[PDB]
């Protein structure tokens, strides 16, 4: 019940129903217009209090953090997801943004560092192949030249069931490579700001991707995407880059939506 409250009013702060700077509903109140019990509602009003998006304490009651003015300290947090959480449009708007700016830093990458861009995309493709076609995550790790550092980024010690944990580990490794593709290409634009954006969001990226790429169909789609990214780069027809990235954004988004109606909770 807490997770639902969590996500409801979080995404109500985002979509401006409980605007930044407003006083949040006193509480008697807020449990009908959330529609859940309040032992749980303020176990999550303190959860929510400050993971960094509400105010605490006694006499004057609770408003939401900031209007924003400027404290960029801890604004992404808690954080996120999957989307049993927020993501709302937050993660989906971030993803929309990734689709938005990707043709930019990738057009750059393909022009200034054709070189590297091809070297990276080829690397990523090769690795994802050895990942998804190994009969095990342990097999994959056994034959991978980069086993040790993968292990210093990829870990799972919250799932005991080996087969499930291994499915999860493969997902994490694939996200690892998706991130590699985007982050490296972004840094190979020549304008560092893009790469920095990816580095600052790497946690959020890691979790969301760990989730999104538990879907085989996602992994496949992504792998073909990486592929004609490479083809476009090699060919020089950087007029097809935004088509490719847009259609990818579309198909990936439709999968995102298919992991939504489906499945559990």
Ligand X SMILES: CCCCCCCC/C=C\CCCCCCCC(=O)SCCNC(=O)CCNC(=O)[C@H](O)C(C)(C)COP(=O)(O)OP(=O)(O)OC[C@H]1O[C@@H](n2cnc3c(N)ncnc32)[C@H](O)[C@@H]1OP(=O)(O)O
Please tell me the distance from the alpha carbon of residue 164 to that of residue 36, in angstroms, as a whole number: 32
Our CB check for ligand X shows the closer of 146 and 220 to be: 146
Task: Determine, following the binding rule CB under 6 A, whether residue 225 of this chain makes contact with ligand X.
Answer: no
Q: Which does 22 bind (CB under 5 to 8 A by kind): a second copy, ligand X, none?
A: none
Using the contact rule CB under 6 A, the part of the chain among 34-42, 105-113, 133-141, 161-169 near ligand X is 105-113
Burial code of 118-143, b = ≥16 C-beta within 10 A, e = fewer?
A: bebbebbbebbebbeebeebeebbee
Our CB check for ligand X shows the closer of 59 and 72 to be: 72
190: left (phi over 0), alpha (psi -120 to 50) or beta: left
Our CB check for ligand X shows the closer of 37 and 243 to be: 243
Cβ 40 to ligand X shortest distance, Å: 22
Site for a second copy in 107-166 (CB under 8 A): none
Our CB check for a second copy shows the closer of 92 and 167 to be: 92
Tokens of 187: 């840094």
Among 24, 45, 107, 219, binds ligand X (CB under 6 A): 107
Task: Determine, following the binding rule CB under 6 A, whether residue 99 of this chain makes contact with ligand X.
Answer: yes
Question: What distances in angstroms separate CA 205 from CA 22, 91, 107, 182, 183, one per listed residue?
Answer: 30, 9, 22, 11, 11
Task: Determine, following the binding rule CB under 6 A, whether residue 73 of this chain makes contact with ligand X.
Answer: no
Among 49, 76, 132, 139, binds ligand X (CB under 6 A): 76
SS3 percent helix, strand, coil of the chain, rounded to 5, is: 65, 0, 30
Rg of the chain over CA atoms, in angstroms? Answer: 21
Cβ 1 to ligand X shortest distance, Å: 23
Please tell me the distance from the alpha carbon of residue 262 to that of residue 215, in angstroms, as a whole number: 11
> Does residue 23 sit in helix, strand or coil?
strand
Binding site for ligand X (CB under 6 A): 13-14, 16, 19-20, 68, 72, 75-76, 90-92, 94-101, 104, 107-108, 111, 116, 120, 123, 127, 146, 149-150, 175, 178, 184, 187, 192-193, 195-197, 200-201, 204-205, 208-209, 212, 246, 249-250, 252-253, 256
């Amino acid at each position: 019940p807490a997770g639902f409250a969590e996500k409801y009013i979080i995404e109500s702060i985002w979509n401006g129903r409980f605007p930044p700077g407003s006083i949040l509903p006193a509480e008697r109140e807020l449990s009908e217009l959330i529609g859940v019990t309040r032992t749980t509602l303020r176990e999550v009003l303190q959860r929510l209090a400050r993971d960094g998006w509400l105010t605490i304490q006694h006499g004057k009651p609770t408003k939401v953090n900031q209007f924003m003015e400027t404290s960029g300290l801890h604004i992404l947090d808690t954080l996120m997801t999957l989307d049993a959480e927020n993501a709302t449009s937050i993660v989906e708007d971030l993803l929309a943004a990734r689709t938005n700016i990707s043709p930019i830093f990738m057009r750059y990458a393909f022009k200034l560092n054709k070189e590297s861009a091809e070297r990276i995309m080829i690397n990523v493709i090769e690795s994802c192949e050895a990942l998804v076609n190994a009969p095990s995550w342990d097999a994959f790790i056994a034959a991978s030249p980069y086993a040790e550092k993968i292990q210093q980024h990829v870990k799972e010690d919250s799932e005991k069931d080996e087969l499930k944990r291994q499915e999860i580990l493969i997902a994490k490794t694939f996200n690892f490579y998706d991130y590699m593709l985007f982050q490296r290409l972004a840094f190979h634009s020549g304008n560092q700001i893009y790469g920095l954006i990816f580095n600052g969001l790497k946690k959020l990226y890691d979790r969301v991707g760990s989730y999104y790429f538990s879907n085989p169909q996602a992994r496949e789609l992504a792998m073909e995407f990486y592929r004609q990214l490479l083809a476009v780069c090699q060919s020089g027809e950087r007029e097809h880059l935004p088509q490719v990235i847009r259609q990818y954004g579309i198909a990936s988004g439709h999968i995102w939506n298919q992991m939504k109606m489906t499945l559990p909770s």
